[PDB]
Amino acid sequence: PIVEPFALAHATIVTGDKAGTILRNMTIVVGADGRIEQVAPSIETSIPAEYHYLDGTGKIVMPGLINAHTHLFSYMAATVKHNATTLLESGVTTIRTLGDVGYEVVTLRDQIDAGQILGPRILASGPLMAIPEGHGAPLIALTSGTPEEARTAVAQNLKAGVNAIKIAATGGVTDAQEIQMSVEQMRAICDEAHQYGVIVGAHAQSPEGVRRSLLAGVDTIEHGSVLDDELIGMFRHNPNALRGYSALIPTLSAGLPLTLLGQDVTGITDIQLENSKNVVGGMVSGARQAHEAGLMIGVGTDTGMTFVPQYATWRELELLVAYAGFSPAEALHAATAVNASILGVDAETGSLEVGKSADLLVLNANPLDDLRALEHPALVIAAGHPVWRPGPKRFADIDALLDEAYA
């Protein structure tokens, strides 16, 4: 698969910047190297010879969506490739997995990077690290509680080729908020990962878990909890984080289903429902607080969960607006530019600027006026490679349940 240069003309560009800026009748020229060569008014932009022509009249083009929290499993090679393809077809050009079964995603990422397979840019975490809980989940089990065991475990992942790390600082959404992974354990994991420039994410649904993760130097907090001034300060300036700051990935899409859908649908016990309500309340409140404090907040959804479709990244933006006080513009900015910075790939993607990877998402309507415009992309282009497929295969039953639930 070779990248054939092309030019997408007459499109309305939704930049995804903090201001919610839109540029009318624009042409985006993509080179043979898969990078953006020009972004200018169509009327003054001539299409180079041999370049293919894409007529974007009546269309909106924006940076590809980015999902900072995914799983490519609910034979293994085909399964992970299928799910990565679904994400791409939904318009997501960069993803970070946070808990793989083994090193199958590393393998997939390498094939995509080599140009052997069409797919999104992937930050693969390999198996997540955590204290086993007996749920049969895949992970690198830390059972001694020592920093040495944790450092050895992360080294195994790094040696295997991961370019992301995931730690379970606490239990899940259906678990109690405890007052477990120690700061010492996570500090060893973060120190080691950072030596190799790898970003670390920690799943935490309690203030204590968030606090310990931040103290250890974790780069991203997944889910989160209600915050206070001490924690906000730890997000803003974290001397132990790879880039001196930590970001929050609320992943509202993963918690809300458990509290909005009936137990007859979810199948969780009464105690799990109560636990979920307490955790989700903290995730929502914390996201609002973080937004209010101007912290770095990204878009991730924890795909692979029974009620979190691989193709529903767009829903997270609607949830940030409805629950965290985000404006559509800010949500689009979080899903692109901010996510890119958080994942450390802002130099190559996240915005439609000359020199960056041609990760384009073409829409039939303006998402600033209605975020649901994101649900059905017109065309997705990954690193200059147009995806010649209709879109993701959707599950009407699940989509119907979620639509009603979020209504």
The CATH number of residue 9's host domain is 2.30.40.10
Torsion angle in degrees (nearest 10) through CA of 193, 203, 347, 25: 170
State how beta strands 360-363 and 379-382 pair: antiparallel
The CATH number of residue 121's host domain is 3.30.110.90
Comparing CA positions, the residue from 332, 302, 141 lying closest to residue 220 is 302
Cα–Cα distance, 250 to 290 (Å, whole number): 10
Q: Which of 193, 217, 250 is the last residue of a domain?
A: 250
Instruction: Tell me if residue 228 falls in helix, strand or coil.
Output: coil
Q: Which of 196, 225, 250 is the last residue of a domain?
A: 250
Residue 276, strand partner residues:
none
Q: How far apart are the first and last CA of the chain?
A: 42
Instruction: Tell me if residue 27 falls in helix, strand or coil.
Output: strand
- Burial class of residue 148 in the structure, from the number of CB atoms within 10 Å of its CB (0-12 exposed, 13-18 middle, 19+ buried): exposed
Amino acid 337 reads A
Q: Are residues 399 and 255 in the same domain?
A: yes
Is the CB of residue 308 less than 8 Å from the CB of residue 395? Answer: no
Q: Are residues 242 and 173 in the same domain?
A: yes
Tokens of 401: 């349940």
Furthest C-alpha separation in the chain? 66
Which value in Å is the resolution of this experimental model? 1.7
Is the CB of residue 100 less than 8 Å from the CB of residue 124? Answer: yes
Q: Are residues 271 and 402 in the same domain?
A: yes
Q: Are residues 164 and 236 in the same domain?
A: yes
Comparing CA positions, the residue from 60, 54, 13 lying closest to residue 351 is 13
Instruction: Tell me if residue 184 falls in helix, strand or coil.
Output: helix
Q: Give just the sign of the alpha carbon dihedral 365, 367, 368, 370.
A: positive
Q: Are residues 188 and 314 in the same domain?
A: no
Comparing CA positions, the residue from 306, 342, 300, 293 lying closest to residue 319 is 300
Is the CB of residue 313 less than 8 Å from the CB of residue 65? Answer: yes
For residue 282, give the H/E element and its range: helix 270-292
Q: Are residues 171 and 241 in the same domain?
A: yes
Please give the full DSSP string across 116-145, using - where no structure is assigned.
SS---EEE---S-EE---SS----EE--S-
Q: Are residues 264 and 396 in the same domain?
A: yes
Cα–Cα distance, 248 to 234 (Å, whole number): 11
Q: How many CA atoms lie within 13 A of 351 on its CB side?
A: 19
Comparing CA positions, the residue from 24, 47, 118, 21 lying closest to residue 386 is 118
Cα separations (Å) of 269 from 175, 178, 264, 274, 393? 11, 19, 10, 9, 31
- Burial class of residue 30 in the structure, from the number of CB atoms within 10 Å of its CB (0-12 exposed, 13-18 middle, 19+ buried): buried
Q: Are residues 246 and 278 in the same domain?
A: no
Q: Give just the sign of the alpha carbon dihedral 375, 379, 383, 385.
A: positive
Amino acid 358 reads A
Please give the full DSSP string across 68-103, using - where no structure is assigned.
EEE-S---HHHHHHHHHHHHHHTTEEEEEES--SSS
Is the CB of residue 324 less than 8 Å from the CB of residue 284? Answer: yes
Is the CB of residue 195 less than 8 Å from the CB of residue 253? Answer: no
Q: Are residues 278 and 151 in the same domain?
A: no
State how beta strands 22-30 and 6-14 pair: antiparallel
In the numeric block, the tokens 């996510």 are attached to 339
Q: Are residues 323 and 381 in the same domain?
A: no
Domain ranges, residue 261:
251-327+392-406
Q: Could you give phi then psi for residue 214, rounded to 5 degrees?
A: -65, -40
Tokens of 299: 């878009």
Q: Are residues 221 and 262 in the same domain?
A: no
Number of structural domains in the chain: 4
Cα–Cα distance, 323 to 155 (Å, whole number): 38
Cα–Cα distance, 204 to 242 (Å, whole number): 19
Cα–Cα distance, 372 to 316 (Å, whole number): 11
Is the CB of residue 171 less than 8 Å from the CB of residue 187? Answer: no
Q: Are residues 283 and 340 in the same domain?
A: no
DSSP state of 338: I
The CATH number of residue 194's host domain is 3.40.50.10910
Comparing CA positions, the residue from 362, 366, 343 lying closest to residue 352 is 362
Instruction: Tell me if residue 350 falls in helix, strand or coil.
Output: coil
- Burial class of residue 119 in the structure, from the number of CB atoms within 10 Å of its CB (0-12 exposed, 13-18 middle, 19+ buried): buried
Is the CB of residue 340 less than 8 Å from the CB of residue 94? Answer: yes
DSSP state of 385: E
Q: Which of 206, 234, 250 is the last residue of a domain?
A: 250
